[PDB]
Amino acid sequence: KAPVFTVRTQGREYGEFVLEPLERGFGVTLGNPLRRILLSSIPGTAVTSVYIEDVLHEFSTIPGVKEDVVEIILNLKELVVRFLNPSLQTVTLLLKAEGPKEVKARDFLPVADVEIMNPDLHIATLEEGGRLNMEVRVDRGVGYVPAEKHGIKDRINAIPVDAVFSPVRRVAFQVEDTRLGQRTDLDKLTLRIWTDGSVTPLEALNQAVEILREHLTYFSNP
Amino acid sequence: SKLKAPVFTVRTQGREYGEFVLEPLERGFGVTLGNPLRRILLSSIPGTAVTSVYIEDVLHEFSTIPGVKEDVVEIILNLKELVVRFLNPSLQTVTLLLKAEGPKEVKARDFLPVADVEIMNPDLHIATLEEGGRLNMEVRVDRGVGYVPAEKHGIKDRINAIPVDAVFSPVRRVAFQVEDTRLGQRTDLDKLTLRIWTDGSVTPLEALNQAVEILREHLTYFSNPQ
Amino acid sequence: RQRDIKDEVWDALEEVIHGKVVLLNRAPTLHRLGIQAFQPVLVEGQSIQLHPLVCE
Amino acid sequence: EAALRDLDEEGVVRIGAEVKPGDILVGRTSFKGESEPTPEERLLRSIFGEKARDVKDTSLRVPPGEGGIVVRTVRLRRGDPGVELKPGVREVVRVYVAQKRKLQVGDKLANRHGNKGVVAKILPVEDMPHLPDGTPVDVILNPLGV
Amino acid sequence: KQYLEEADRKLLQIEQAYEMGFLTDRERYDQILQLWTETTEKVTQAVFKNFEENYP
Amino acid sequence: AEPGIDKLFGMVDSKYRLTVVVAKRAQQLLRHGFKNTVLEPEERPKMQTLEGLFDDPNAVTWAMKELLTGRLVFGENLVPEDRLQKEMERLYPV
Amino acid sequence: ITQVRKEKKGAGLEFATPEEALAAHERGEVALNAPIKVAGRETSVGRLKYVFANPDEALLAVAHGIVDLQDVVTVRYMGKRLETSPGRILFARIVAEAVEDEKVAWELIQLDV
Amino acid sequence: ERVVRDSLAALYAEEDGEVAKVDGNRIVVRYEDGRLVEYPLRRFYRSNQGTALDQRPRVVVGQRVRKGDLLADGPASENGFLALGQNVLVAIMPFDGY
Amino acid sequence: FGKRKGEGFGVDKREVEVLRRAEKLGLVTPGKTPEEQLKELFLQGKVVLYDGRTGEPIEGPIVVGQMFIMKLYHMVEDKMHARSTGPYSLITQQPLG
Ligand SMILES: [Mg+2]
């Protein structure tokens, strides 16, 4: 028969998806491709490049700022940005602040059709006379591209950042034996998806399944 | 920068073998596509197999026939290699008849011809007969999926019928190659090649299509949440 | 008669054993961990399945 | 009649029959030891109006876990040519039951070097580790045994 | 190969010191066993150092 | 591991006294047909059949869950045995 | 998964600037995990190149084959900047999720071994 | 090979000759002497331990055999060689704790 | 292998990955061609092996070959046994063995 599909969601960041019963072997036959896709192919956004005014390179330290440049770049990797305009392929975010203030995400200058999902995200703490002037480059992409691999520079002194595009943070799947009547060898698929909230776990799965179906159509025309 | 539907190449030798290329594909999709199809091809492809045998004057599998060199155990083991193609898709079962005698080596050729039914390996040896050796049997061939041992199905058309282990799957071997490729701007693309071997009752291309349809129909199951 | 046994009795047996445990013993029983209790999971097949961690 | 289906006229299971646990191999009756039926049986017999038979069912049956195909039967009576039994024995029946045994979980394998183990899992061919050219392996042996 | 070639020359020295009557049959036997004990130990450490350094 | 076993061992001076309390309570539940239970309809241990959720038949599972609630009182010389047996049969016949 | 690589190509060279080291590693003169001294400290190329915001990022990089689980790398976990393998992070996460106490988990594990 | 021959499970030709008849149940051999020798084969007999001892004809009608040539394989022999098992393709590797 | 190269297939991507970890293991000599390294492993009796569940390789080359294995006389069919109640002994009235 046709498997029953079961959803358990927590907010926008987590979901568990159970498909049972399946014929023997099909749990891993479905689970592995979906996991590969869910990690590699799900469209998302990432910080690809950063300019900080008086900072020459990635390991420099900023006078008047507690965090070093490395730590600021790290915090930027954690920024979750959602593009509302389907055609928008990239954006530059600007931040300038100084004096005694803890700079959060909200402080970034609002840009049209760009939603900052986690505005309370810490970026840096600034002391008296500390000055933070920076531009961050946010691109649309999929998967994970290391900084040294994309090598994007808007200008000199722009520092390329390992680009974490994937809205999917983790995928775990477990297949376990199950029985319908007399047949005990059937499969039960439990799929666990963690996203950053821009794409929902249920959304991501549907996107993953869609990609695979489309790829199945590629066996049509010789 | 988003990749687009790949060219799909097909290289077939007869009905036994085929090579199926898909390129270019996004990095990592070689195994993402290749593996579930390999898994589905080895398991879920419907086919045909001998499910039961009645040999005249033979009460059970452990018998032996005067004039015949092979014991019934070996005879049934030879019938497990019989490849029977059904031309009519509506036909789910056939009983083949064989009558042989004299100093002959009975092969699969000797089965009495049935309409819309083709024996893909007519040279397969069945029994060695000697002067006075008489082999008259009825083998029931069915359409099915996977591996169904005789203990599960227990199929007997008559009382002295011997149920046979049925290996239904037409697929003999599946391998897939993943090779490096480029669109000349972009690198680390995947070129996927599905090598598919069959017994000939179903075609590697036919096999691949059924495999794709099973996986496709399976992705359907994610539709109604709860 | 084994051929008279239908499929509802297997479901009934699952209900019967629900929450119950059995004792597994292996000789020689050298110390008290030679017997331990397990909640049984019914299986096809004639072998008892033992958890790796208790093998020592 | 369901129970007697595979027995011949004389009560011996027919050659070629499949026998499973509980099945009769050779039918036999024994005269009931003299006993007075309990008042419950007196009342039960009276309610249903059926005489309690003089004989009891002592038939030989397939033991738990055994069974197969009947390949031979030997029957030896008393007073037939060439055969004389031990005193008191009227007749002896032997039933030879054969089984084709496939390898299964719990069966023991070994090589000639002292590697021995019981089969714990039978995987479908698609789960088996395989060579690049598509060939699956047969057996997976743990290196920790070496 | 090094420890074995070294062990053989050591063994030769114990044979020369025997045939000259410096040590008894007992003492010679005891010295041979000791040499081989230490030579064994040496090759054990060599197996594991090569593993640790060159094939961890 | 049994759910809340560490807390159950917390409640007694000797692990063996927990076993006595669990065992006796389960006997009470069986004798009186579960209708003396201290659990509430949503706290009842459940068992998944082919039909659907049904009551867990197992009285030892029940008794441990009851104990964890806190609603059971256990000790020595709490009440004469006959008086306990008769009062339980008055409240929950058989 | 908790064993870390030790490579011989770098062989304890001194480097003034980390970008010099990455450049030298990029030239293929020094292995990723080879022990090295950049400025006064002795670190490895992998610790400079790959600096991960959180565990999930390190393991996503492993998933994409940027690094293996045995490569030593810089990962930010529970507020501190650590030099370990993604594998050791994975082990700590296994423990942490099993016991559903993340702080205690971190206390129990010996992570550096 | 020697183990099968001393075991007496396998069947061999007495002298040089030509095979007259081959059956599941029997093999008839015509020797140099002209005498026609018939070898019945033990088929599906039960051993003390209940394993099946059964002999299978390894020659065909009209085959020229020499003295000591194999006629039938006994149990656990393949073409006269001791066969206690199968040759299987093995991978040495842990697998998911099975 | 030589068969494959004539059939029009080159080294697999995953075969390269296994080769990478293998030269990290000191199994193959660095700088040789993919074919040369696969042959070096094959002389050590190891081959590249694919997990049938995933399609991804086993992270290291694995020893594969033909082994002679016997099925011994100890078979579960013979040994599996259970009893609820049954025969008891004459004097002791304890279950039989
Ligand atoms: Mg970096």
From Swiss-Prot, chain A:
Q: What are the EC numbers?
A: 2.7.7.6
- One GO cellular component from the entry? DNA-directed RNA polymerase complex
Q: Which GO terms describe its molecular function?
A: DNA binding; DNA-directed RNA polymerase activity; protein dimerization activity
Catalysed reaction per UniProt?
RNA(n) + a ribonucleoside 5'-triphosphate = RNA(n+1) + diphosphate
Q: Which residues form a coiled coil?
A: none
What's this chain's function?
DNA-dependent RNA polymerase catalyzes the transcription of DNA into RNA using the four ribonucleoside triphosphates as substrates.
Assembly description = Homodimer. The RNAP catalytic core consists of 2 alpha, 1 beta, 1 beta' and 1 omega subunit. When a sigma factor is associated with the core the holoenzyme is formed, which can initiate transcription.
Q: Which family does it belong to?
A: Belongs to the RNA polymerase alpha chain family.
Give the protein's recorded name: DNA-directed RNA polymerase subunit alpha
Organism in which the protein naturally occurs: Thermus thermophilus (strain ATCC BAA-163 / DSM 7039 / HB27)
Q: Lineage of the source organism?
A: Bacteria, Thermotogati, Deinococcota, Deinococci, Thermales
Location of this fragment in the whole protein = 7 to 228 of 315
UniProtKB/Swiss-Prot annotation, chain F:
Domain of life per record: Bacteria
Q: Which Pfam families match?
A: RNA_pol_Rpb6 (PF01192)
A GO cellular component annotation in the UniProt record? DNA-directed RNA polymerase complex
Q: Which reaction does it catalyse?
A: RNA(n) + a ribonucleoside 5'-triphosphate = RNA(n+1) + diphosphate
Regions that span the bilayer: none
Q: Which SMART domains match?
A: RNA_pol_Rpb6
Assembly with partners or alone:
The RNAP catalytic core consists of 2 alpha, 1 beta, 1 beta' and 1 omega subunit. When a sigma factor is associated with the core the holoenzyme is formed, which can initiate transcription.
User: What does this gene product do?
Assistant: Promotes RNA polymerase assembly. Latches the N- and C-terminal regions of the beta' subunit thereby facilitating its interaction with the beta and alpha subunits.
Q: Which family does it belong to?
A: Belongs to the RNA polymerase subunit omega family.
Q: What is this protein called?
A: DNA-directed RNA polymerase subunit omega
**Which species is listed as the source?**
Thermus thermophilus (strain ATCC 27634 / DSM 579 / HB8)
From Swiss-Prot, chain G:
Coiled-coil regions listed:
none
Q: Which residues form the signal peptide?
A: none
Q: What does the UniProt record say this protein does?
A: DNA-dependent RNA polymerase catalyzes the transcription of DNA into RNA using the four ribonucleoside triphosphates as substrates.
Quaternary structure annotation from Swiss-Prot or TrEMBL = The RNAP catalytic core consists of 2 alpha, 1 beta, 1 beta' and 1 omega subunit. When a sigma factor is associated with the core the holoenzyme is formed, which can initiate transcription.
Q: What family is reported?
A: Belongs to the RNA polymerase beta' chain family.
What's the protein here called?
Answer: DNA-directed RNA polymerase subunit beta'
UniProtKB/Swiss-Prot annotation, chain H:
What is the top-level taxon of the source organism? Bacteria
Q: Which family does it belong to?
A: Belongs to the RNA polymerase beta chain family.
The record describes its quaternary structure and partners as: The RNAP catalytic core consists of 2 alpha, 1 beta, 1 beta' and 1 omega subunit. When a sigma factor is associated with the core the holoenzyme is formed, which can initiate transcription.
Could you identify this protein by its name?
DNA-directed RNA polymerase subunit beta
What is this protein for, i.e. what is its function? DNA-dependent RNA polymerase catalyzes the transcription of DNA into RNA using the four ribonucleoside triphosphates as substrates.
